[PDB]
Amino acid sequence: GSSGSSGLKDIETACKLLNITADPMDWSPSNVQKWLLWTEHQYRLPPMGKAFQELAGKELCAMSEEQFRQRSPLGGDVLHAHLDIWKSAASGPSSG
Template identity: 75%
Template sequence: MEWNCGNVQKWLLWTEHLYRLPQVGKAFQDLDGKDLCSMSEEDFRQRSPQCSETLHAHLDIWKSEADELWSEADSSCSGQPIHLWQFLRELLLKPHSYGRCIRWLNKEKGIFKIEDSAHVARLWGLRKNRPAMNYDKLSRSIRQYYKKGIIRKPDISQRLVYQFVHPV
């Protein structure tokens, strides 16, 4: 990520405002984009214990968007293991292959439905090399994203319907 220290501070201010977080900018004032992207969740926790999960998760969203847009460019942020939310988005972006098991209800708002929960869980298990994966385990992981501000239930709650907080 080609951000200087000022860009990192602007991103932090925007993220603090978006998630109503306490100000953490001083803890990150010496970092440029490359340094920020190389931080683990534990590194975030050391600099900002109360906001680390949200900041790290939000940065993951930015990094994956950048990777997708400039997949051929050399990026210091790539090479990390895939997260479930990224995997779900990957399936959603290939409707010709996975439209029977997961589909958009409203792409602009980031609302999607898992049509075949067992199949999606099997695919995730294959991807992560966890053959015992089932939908109970998968849905537990999805619910963890509620706290991180990545996925939520839409305003009109339906079974197996979810919404990306920041539309894809």
């Protein structure tokens, strides 16, 4: 039903206090900001919300590591990284 294959089990836990969707490509309207300030505080990253303020769930996932670094040098890789886990789980458990 709701739960699928191991891995995202930890993702949902991050969407509970954020009230967002496990799927990063669905982050809207400005859910991205939530997924940002979340890990941003767990990795001590700078304020990206302003750089991604225009970016959305789809975009973020549609972007590339380098891209995430083009807006956030101190982080970048961090975003595209902590995100992979989401997008990966959102892209179906086996096929998607």
